[PDB]
Design a protein around this ligand. Structure first.
Ligand SMILES: [Mg+2]
Ligand SMILES: [Mg+2]
Ligand SMILES: [Mg+2]
Ligand SMILES: [Mg+2]
Ligand SMILES: [Mg+2]
Ligand SMILES: [Mg+2]
Ligand SMILES: [Mg+2]
Ligand SMILES: [Mg+2]
Ligand SMILES: [Mg+2]
Ligand SMILES: [Mg+2]
Ligand SMILES: [Mg+2]
Ligand SMILES: [Mg+2]
Ligand SMILES: [Mg+2]
Ligand SMILES: [Mg+2]
Ligand SMILES: [Mg+2]
Ligand SMILES: [Mg+2]
Ligand SMILES: [Mg+2]
Ligand SMILES: [Mg+2]
Ligand SMILES: [Mg+2]
Ligand SMILES: [Mg+2]
Ligand SMILES: [Mg+2]
Ligand SMILES: [Mg+2]
Ligand SMILES: [Mg+2]
Ligand SMILES: [Mg+2]
Ligand SMILES: [Mg+2]
Ligand SMILES: [Mg+2]
Ligand SMILES: [Mg+2]
Ligand SMILES: [Mg+2]
Ligand SMILES: [Mg+2]
Ligand SMILES: [Mg+2]
Ligand SMILES: [Mg+2]
Ligand SMILES: [Mg+2]
Ligand SMILES: [Mg+2]
Ligand SMILES: [Mg+2]
Ligand SMILES: [Mg+2]
Ligand SMILES: [Mg+2]
Ligand SMILES: [Mg+2]
Ligand SMILES: [Mg+2]
Ligand SMILES: [Mg+2]
Ligand SMILES: [Mg+2]
Ligand SMILES: [Mg+2]
Ligand SMILES: [Mg+2]
Ligand SMILES: [Mg+2]
Ligand SMILES: [Mg+2]
Ligand SMILES: [Mg+2]
Ligand SMILES: [Mg+2]
Ligand SMILES: [Mg+2]
Ligand SMILES: [Mg+2]
Ligand SMILES: [Mg+2]
Ligand SMILES: [Mg+2]
Ligand SMILES: [Mg+2]
Ligand SMILES: [Mg+2]
Ligand SMILES: [Mg+2]
Ligand SMILES: [Mg+2]
Ligand SMILES: [Mg+2]
Ligand SMILES: [Mg+2]
Ligand SMILES: [Mg+2]
Ligand SMILES: [Mg+2]
Ligand SMILES: [Mg+2]
Ligand SMILES: [Mg+2]
Ligand SMILES: [Mg+2]
Ligand SMILES: [Mg+2]
Ligand SMILES: [Mg+2]
Ligand SMILES: [Mg+2]
Ligand SMILES: [Mg+2]
Ligand SMILES: [Mg+2]
Ligand SMILES: [Mg+2]
Ligand SMILES: [Mg+2]
Ligand SMILES: [Mg+2]
Ligand SMILES: [Mg+2]
Ligand SMILES: [Mg+2]
Ligand SMILES: [Mg+2]
Ligand SMILES: [Mg+2]
Ligand SMILES: [Mg+2]
Ligand SMILES: [Mg+2]
Ligand SMILES: [Mg+2]
Ligand SMILES: [Mg+2]
Ligand SMILES: [Mg+2]
Ligand SMILES: [Mg+2]
Ligand SMILES: [Mg+2]
Ligand SMILES: [Mg+2]
Ligand SMILES: [Mg+2]
Ligand SMILES: [Mg+2]
Ligand SMILES: [Mg+2]
Ligand SMILES: [Mg+2]
Ligand SMILES: [Mg+2]
Ligand SMILES: [Mg+2]
Ligand SMILES: [Mg+2]
Ligand SMILES: [Mg+2]
Ligand SMILES: [Mg+2]
Ligand SMILES: [Mg+2]
Ligand SMILES: [Mg+2]
Ligand SMILES: [Mg+2]
Ligand SMILES: [Mg+2]
Ligand SMILES: [Mg+2]
Ligand SMILES: [Mg+2]
Ligand SMILES: [Mg+2]
Ligand SMILES: [Mg+2]
Ligand SMILES: [Mg+2]
Ligand SMILES: [Mg+2]
Ligand SMILES: [Mg+2]
Lengths: 260, 200, 126, 148
RNA sequence: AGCGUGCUACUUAUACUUCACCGUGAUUGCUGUUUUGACGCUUUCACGAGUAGGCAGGCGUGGAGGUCAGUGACGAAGCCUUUGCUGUAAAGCUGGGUCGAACGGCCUCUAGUGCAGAUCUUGGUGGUAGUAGCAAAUAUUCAAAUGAGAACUUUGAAGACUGAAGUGGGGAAAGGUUCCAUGUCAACAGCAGUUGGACAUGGGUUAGUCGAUCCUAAGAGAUGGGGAAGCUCCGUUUCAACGUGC
RNA sequence: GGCGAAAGACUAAUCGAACCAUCUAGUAGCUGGUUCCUGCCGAAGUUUCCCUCAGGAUAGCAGAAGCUCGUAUCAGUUUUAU
RNA sequence: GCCUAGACCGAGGACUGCGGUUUUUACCUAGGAUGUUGGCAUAAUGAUCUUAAGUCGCCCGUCUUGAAACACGGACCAAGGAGUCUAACGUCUAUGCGAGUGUUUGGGUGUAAAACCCGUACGCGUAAUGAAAGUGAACGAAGGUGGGGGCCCAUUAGGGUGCACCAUCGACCGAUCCUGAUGUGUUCGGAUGGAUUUGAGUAAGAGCAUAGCUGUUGGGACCCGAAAGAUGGUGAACUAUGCCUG
RNA sequence: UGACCUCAAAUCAGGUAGGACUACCCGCUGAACUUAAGCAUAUCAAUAAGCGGAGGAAAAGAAACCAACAGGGAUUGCCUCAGUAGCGGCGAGUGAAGCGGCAAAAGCUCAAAUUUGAAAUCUGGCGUCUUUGGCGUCCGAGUUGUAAUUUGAAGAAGGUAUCUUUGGGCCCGGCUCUUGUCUAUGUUCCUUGGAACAGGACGUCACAGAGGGUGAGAAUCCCGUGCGAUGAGAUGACCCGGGUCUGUGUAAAGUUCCUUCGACGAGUCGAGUUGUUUGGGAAUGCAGCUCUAAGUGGGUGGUAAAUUCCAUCUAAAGCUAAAUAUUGGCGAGAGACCGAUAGCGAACAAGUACAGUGAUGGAAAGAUGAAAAGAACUUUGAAAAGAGAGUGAAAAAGUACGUGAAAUUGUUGAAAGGGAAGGGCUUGAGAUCAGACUUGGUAUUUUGCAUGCUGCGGUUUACCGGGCCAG
């Protein structure tokens, strides 16, 4: 708010003894503003309690390694069909994830051709989902340049841009991203894992140089992909295994019988 | 006002500090405009480099002796050793410093070698030069083409040679000699004048 | 999406530029599409509506009506067609105001400036 | 976030957690470190002894660069040897050829003598060493070479 | 049906006993039947007062990312209502009426986020109450005219008063069109109104001789100068080569 | 500051120091208020110091988070001995 | 031991148990209600609203030892209305990396305040102690003793090994005090051995960074509230006093 | 009879200054509230108010610097140094600098020198021309010093081996800025609606699915958006690329070495004292007064003094872009901001109406409808109005205009009521609401379907069993 809002008055308290509250009041006469309360957060025309300041903290620091951790986790989550489906993507007619497309799609220059390729590879039902999802935003945010809302479509990741970025620019919901610069705002929109990612072959083959492997060092300086604290992530087979089940005592009833 | 087992703080906020709060909202905007200024400056004078050649100098003080960094300009003696006048040097991308001198040979030799390396890659155009030759050149980054390079620390294998006096004893004796130099010299002067004045 | 830094996506700025548009600016805003016959005759798809054009109403309660434009009433952002009248219980008739984007031009009023405008826009006039 | 604060939970309760008798006030007790010798003596004496008074001599215009002398102990000295060549050096080091460790070039002023060295000759270049650090270096067959 | 004393029965607390249900704490068991909930299900026992205060789990509001390819001009939101349902509750959902353009559920983010009070703020509305009151300045009445309408307008007749230090006839200050004619009654004239200093439309102020203008008064104040960091202060012919001379 | 045949009178309904704006959201150990639900736990008015006595700090009382363990050796009680 | 009158309740939901009778691998009263009959389903039944009757019930908020108080605020209603943000911090928690850690001053890059990338320095940590000159952390399996979860060997017990941590006696580094070797710019050096002394130390590192709650200090600082103080201006149309002209 | 010096006058010829704005900038002057739990030093604060002066930036700036190193190297800003050294009733508090990483980088000008074989310099008048000016000429300024030459990094004067570099004016381009013109695809069908811009079907364009308008949520109706293309105007000693005309280059400048020299700022430095200020502490800067220099001298080297050294600069004269600041002006783009008691005081004829002698103080107030289609006409009334009618999708939109809450009020209906009313619990009464003959199953007949009898409402008596209330 303005630094002087509510404080452009010469108001002075009347003091006690005049049967009115001790709030400051406008002086003078001849206008209806005269004698009216001022300066108070409870007063009409006063300044708000604790007026908002610009030196509030707006940007937040995140450790670079943790940010990379989360980016890798989101990329990994993009290959889990259950996560992509819970994420809301119409991916039921894609035969396997990750969806990798040939490099000719890096060279499409017309939106018609890019849409045709999206239709061919089975990624256009999610574009149709974006098209059908357009609604007027609820609330005053529509007065602030945010008039419509819609879903997110597929994310197309390339290695070389020979026209694909501009060809997909106008398709609603589709985002394009270089494999060299992938971030969490695209990989996990809304902090929800499982983005529907369409890789070109070049981007898929560059992933291993970008993030490294057990045989390849990452281009990122001193960076290694994270290690899990658990090796077998399926604990039902760990519990119901020969090694563990051979040393346990026999199980009781799932529910104790009531004896009294 | 003072309560609990807490550190005692020094929060200097008793003046009208809120009238002098500079929040750098324009960090990204200034970064972008700074880059645009840099492109305009480069494109104006291409293929001439945007950076003048800078010398390499030791950083001062006992804390930064080990480090070596870019200086401000080459000394008059250094330019003299490569046969360049300072007035001329300023016009071919070489920086001059009339204030710095060369007490020692090491920095002087490093900067003479640096000037000779830059001078070998220099190509000065003239009227007879056509735009075909000028377009055959790319605008290099002098700060990267002639970087400031730290001398490598000594490492590897060498023969062990053990002096009889330990290093700790050497340091202690140096400290003691410095501490008592003045009083010992005064004592010796008094002794000499006494034993050579009455011995007249 | 817009790319130029000189283009504004502000709703308030766009509406202010519309309702405070000068009369000269309102001429372009009150453009009308040509009919299919004139579009192939002149190879131009829309023109600023002019006083003596003939239009066909394609939207609203007067859809299907035809007539000659009587006035481009630029202050009200409307055109008044020849016989598109509403009859008050008084017995008097007031013209019905129609936006030019809700009609098609079926016959152009031509002069030396209209022809140059059509030829400027890549079309063919005479 | 404000929605997690106890201000949201105090809504509806009269005193906002400040008490009906105490009545949260402007500055009871003073501002800042007021009354440190009078009514906050019991706090400063208990938790900050040594607070009042002068100790030692002043130093006009103290330049901290003069006193720069980072320490490295002996148990950390072989980390300055190249990692790719440490294992070869730990085997083939002798009096005729021992690794040189330039401690100043790595940012250290004094070599201290905590810990144990590998029983392997080394040449340690330092501005300063402690008495025991140099005794331990000589015992493994090494030497300390003073530099500046 | 009092006093002292003894006895039998009977009366009833949120207390005690048995039982149901809620919650809290502990506790039993649950993966070759773990079986799409193990932050889950399940056995058993005990316990439950509370200001100041602490903590936990939830309800609600504005806006943000995501999702429901959610609701909606065949009616969103809002509002009224013994239409009810759900929850210990904060509240959520729903029938009918009204209405007219947006709005919600869920996973998260965020905050200018919840009112009965502060002689709180601004706006609005009551009881009081058709009440206090509309009582100084002697005093009005008859008739006609006008008008829808006359205690109050106009005219006539009368009765009165101010009583020339006036309730008369002019002016200075101050106001500014209130002046005059015509029309005119929504508001204003604390009743009324056809009347008005109200409202609307027009008209109207004529100078050589009346004033201003000119003179100087107490005083105000440039210049030449002298102070003052300076805004400016002093000084008024002043330590001045002072005539736009006749 | 003025002015006062003097009353602290008068200086624009303002006078034992006018009015206006700003510093200024001046400071207040003092008065008043401080906005949803349920669940669990639950006080103090006492010690010492303080120009301290309507206030603080300190210790106590209270909550929360737990941690190390699993009957180890504790108790606002009795007995016996002293 | 036996007979006999009444009231309230019916949690649970295949089996599993303990008993009993055994005519029996069956039955029972024995780990919680079944059987049967009538009526009703336009209704007997239940809930809410209004009202009557019986019984109880003082006006909320506040300060207070004590309020329904003859203590204070509150006529009524709507809308607004009070622990916020920031700099620097303590504890705790989550997360990443870990003897390191922190990309974001800046450079690169960009689909352009985003995302992505880069590294030198620097901050904190990895060494303390002394006023300072200065000096600077292993006798030993990084010590001994008593406990100590877990693990190993056993076979109640018992033995071995015992991290974290607790109590205790030592060792090492710095300061203080004492002693004072070979030596020497003869006044320096300080080996060696000690001391009811002392440090926020060593004794196989634990930190750094981001975020959240709570607490702290400075800021308007939960909201509203002085009497005052200062700086710069405006008034002698009232009034006080002098003067000039009536 | 004339010079010169000093000082005047003119409506003399030609110029220049004042005042405004406020966000940032350069100075002067200068508080107190406040904190210290009192208060006077201190703090607030070298801040507010007051005064003088600028610009697009200002200021500072090419060391009388920092240092103590193996040395850096004009100024400015950022990060850090560092809440540190220090200052402080050593209390409350306060508080820089060097180094280091980076942004940006750019250097120089006078005075002091004899042109002395030639005042070589310049304002002005007059004339003329191709006019931000050139040329010619004449007065004047100026020797009490205007040009050339040098600025300490040097440099001068002689000698010296020769070598290397180069002036100006126009014309078209490019760059920069502004601006004009030009551009893809449905208004196809059905339903609702007053209106399609809604839903459904079939599509199209997309380097354009930003935004706005149009009778409701419109990429495809319109303007735009995106992509570029092409004109016009400007601008630039101090941007470059070409041309083109003159270059009067025995000239100007630099480069190597030798010799002789090498002018370098005074009421200033410095010292004392006083006041203020600073972190600056036997005194950091500034200022007043008193004293008052020197020439390897002078300053600095954060503890006063004398003696001896060392290090490092070179004051008392001057200019200079960029990085830096920016609640003002101008032009733009935005936002997890506010949504008419909010947001600026002001969304409106708002610094308006209105108040005050004055300085000053200072509001309230947005929304019919797509469109006035703003109700013709008849009738009652003095009129305002009313009643019919009419327009409209709606008058449950009539300008006393969207929705239209509460307080408060009228009418109708229901009920209750002996000096309050209101509440809880319980039941009665009245009103309302709810629920199992279940999605009940068993065979049965007829009424109805597009159809070829088949899913299945329909009916009553039978039987199975169920629900609820009870004995
Ligand atoms: Mg406001
Ligand atoms: Mg302190
Ligand atoms: Mg030097
Ligand atoms: Mg409570
Ligand atoms: Mg309350
Ligand atoms: Mg509390
Ligand atoms: Mg209170
Ligand atoms: Mg008390
Ligand atoms: Mg308290
Ligand atoms: Mg009795
Ligand atoms: Mg008795
Ligand atoms: Mg009970
Ligand atoms: Mg309780
Ligand atoms: Mg908000
Ligand atoms: Mg829909
Ligand atoms: Mg309804
Ligand atoms: Mg509705
Ligand atoms: Mg509407
Ligand atoms: Mg949503
Ligand atoms: Mg609020
Ligand atoms: Mg209220
Ligand atoms: Mg009121
Ligand atoms: Mg009233
Ligand atoms: Mg009466
Ligand atoms: Mg009276
Ligand atoms: Mg009469
Ligand atoms: Mg009389
Ligand atoms: Mg009149
Ligand atoms: Mg009246
Ligand atoms: Mg009347
Ligand atoms: Mg009038
Ligand atoms: Mg006269
Ligand atoms: Mg006259
Ligand atoms: Mg006079
Ligand atoms: Mg004067
Ligand atoms: Mg008196
Ligand atoms: Mg008065
Ligand atoms: Mg306040
Ligand atoms: Mg008190
Ligand atoms: Mg309890
Ligand atoms: Mg005391
Ligand atoms: Mg009290
Ligand atoms: Mg049961
Ligand atoms: Mg009672
Ligand atoms: Mg009270
Ligand atoms: Mg009392
Ligand atoms: Mg009470
Ligand atoms: Mg009483
Ligand atoms: Mg009282
Ligand atoms: Mg009171
Ligand atoms: Mg009252
Ligand atoms: Mg409210
Ligand atoms: Mg580091
Ligand atoms: Mg450190
Ligand atoms: Mg030290
Ligand atoms: Mg340790
Ligand atoms: Mg106040
Ligand atoms: Mg005051
Ligand atoms: Mg005072
Ligand atoms: Mg007067
Ligand atoms: Mg003149
Ligand atoms: Mg001025
Ligand atoms: Mg001051
Ligand atoms: Mg203050
Ligand atoms: Mg004080
Ligand atoms: Mg106080
Ligand atoms: Mg005081
Ligand atoms: Mg100060
Ligand atoms: Mg000021
Ligand atoms: Mg200007
Ligand atoms: Mg600039
Ligand atoms: Mg300048
Ligand atoms: Mg110089
Ligand atoms: Mg510098
Ligand atoms: Mg200060
Ligand atoms: Mg630097
Ligand atoms: Mg001339
Ligand atoms: Mg177009
Ligand atoms: Mg629209
Ligand atoms: Mg459609
Ligand atoms: Mg649109
Ligand atoms: Mg000089
Ligand atoms: Mg001063
Ligand atoms: Mg001084
Ligand atoms: Mg002095
Ligand atoms: Mg100078
Ligand atoms: Mg300057
Ligand atoms: Mg800015
Ligand atoms: Mg600006
Ligand atoms: Mg805006
Ligand atoms: Mg407003
Ligand atoms: Mg307002
Ligand atoms: Mg309205
Ligand atoms: Mg009539
Ligand atoms: Mg309607
Ligand atoms: Mg309506
Ligand atoms: Mg209405
Ligand atoms: Mg009502
Ligand atoms: Mg009665
Ligand atoms: Mg009842
Ligand atoms: Mg009933």
């Amino acid at each position: 708010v303005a630094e002087n809002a509510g404080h452009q008055t010469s108001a002075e308290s009347w003091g006690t003894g005049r049967a009115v509250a001790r709030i400051p009041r406008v002086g003078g006469g001849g206008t209806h503003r005269s004698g009216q309360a001022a300066f108070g957060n409870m007063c009409r025309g006063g300044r708000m309690f604790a007026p908002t300041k610009t030196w509030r903290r707006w940007n937040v620091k995140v450790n670079h390694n943790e940010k990379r951790y989360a980016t890798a986790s989101a990329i990994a989550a993009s290959a889990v069909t259950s996560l992509v489906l819970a994420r809301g993507h119409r991916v039921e007619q894609v035969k396997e994830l990750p969806l990798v497309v040939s490099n000719e799609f890096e060279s499409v220059t017309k939106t018609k051709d890019a849409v045709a390729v999206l239709k061919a590879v089975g990624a256009h039902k999610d574009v149709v989902k974006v098209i059908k999802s357009k609604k007027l935003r609820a609330g005053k945010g529509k007065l602030r340049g945010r008039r419509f809302t819609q879903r997110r479509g597929p994310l197309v990741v390339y290695a070389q841009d020979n026209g694909i970025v501009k060809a997909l620019r106008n398709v609603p919901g589709v985002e394009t991203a270089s494999v060299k610069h992938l971030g969490l705002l695209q990989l996990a929109p809304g902090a929800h894992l499982g983005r529907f990612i369409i890789w070109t072959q070049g981007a898929f083959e560059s992933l291993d140089s970008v993030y490294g492997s057990d045989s390849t060092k990452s281009i990122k300086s001193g960076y290694t992909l994270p290690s899990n604290i658990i090796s077998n992530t399926d604990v039902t087979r760990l519990i119901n295994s020969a090694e563990v089940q051979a040393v346990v005592r026999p199980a009781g009833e799932k529910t104790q019988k009531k004896s009294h | 006002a003072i309560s609990k087992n807490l550190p005692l703080l020094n929060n200097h906020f008793r003046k009208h500090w809120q009238e002098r709060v500079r929040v750098h909202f324009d960090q990204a905007g200034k970064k972008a405009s700074r880059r645009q200024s840099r492109l305009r400056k480069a494109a104006k004078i291409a293929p001439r480099p945007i950076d003048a050649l800078r010398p390499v100098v030791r950083a001062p003080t006992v804390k930064y002796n080990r480090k070596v960094r870019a200086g401000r300009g080459f000394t008059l003696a250094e330019l003299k050793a490569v046969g360049i006048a300072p007035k001329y040097a300023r016009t071919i991308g070489i920086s001059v410093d009339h204030r710095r001198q060369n007490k020692s040979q090491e920095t002087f030799d490093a900067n003479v070698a640096r000037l000779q390396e830059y001078k070998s890659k220099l190509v000065i155009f003239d009227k007879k030069t056509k735009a075909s030759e000028v377009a055959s050149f790319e605008q290099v980054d002098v700060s990267a083409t002639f970087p400031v390079e730290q001398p490598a620390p000594e490492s590897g294998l060498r023969a062990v040679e053990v002096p009889e006096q330990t290093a700790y004893r050497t340091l202690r004796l140096a400290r003691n000699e410095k501490k008592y130099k003045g009083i010992r010299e005064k004592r010796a002067k008094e002794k000499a004048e006494a034993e050579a004045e009455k011995a007249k | 999406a817009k790319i130029s830094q000189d283009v504004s996506s502000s709703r308030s700025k766009a509406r202010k530029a519309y309702f405070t548009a000068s009369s000269v600016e309102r001429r372009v805003l009150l453009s009308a599409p040509l009919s299919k016959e004139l579009r192939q005759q002149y190879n131009v798809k829309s023109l600023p509506i002019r006083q003596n054009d003939e239009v066909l109403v394609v939207r609203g309660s007067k859809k299907g009506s035809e007539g000659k434009v009587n006035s481009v009433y630029r202050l009200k952002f409307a055109i008044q067609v020849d016989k598109l009248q509403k009859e008050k219980s008084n017995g008097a008739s007031v013209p019905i105001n129609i936006h030019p984007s809700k009609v098609v031009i079926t016959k152009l009023h031509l002069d030396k400036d209209r022809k140059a405008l059509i030829q400027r826009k890549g079309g063919k006039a005479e | 976030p404000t929605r997690l604060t106890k201000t949201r939970k105090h809504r509806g309760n009269v005193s906002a957690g400040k008490g009906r008798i105490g009545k949260h006030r402007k500055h009871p007790g003073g501002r800042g470190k007021a009354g440190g010798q009078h009514h906050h003596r019991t706090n400063l004496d208990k938790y900050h002894p040594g607070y009042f008074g002068k100790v030692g001599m002043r130093y006009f215009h103290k330049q901290q660069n003069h006193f720069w002398r980072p320490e490295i102990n002996l148990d950390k000295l072989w980390t300055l040897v190249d990692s790719e060549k440490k294992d070869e050096y730990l085997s083939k080091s002798s009096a005729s050829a021992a690794p040189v460790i330039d401690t100043l070039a790595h940012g250290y002023g004094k070599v201290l003598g905590k810990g144990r060295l590998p029983e392997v000759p080394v040449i340690v270049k330092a501005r300063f060493v402690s008495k025991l650090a140099e005794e331990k270096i000589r015992a493994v067959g090494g030497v300390v070479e003073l530099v500046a």
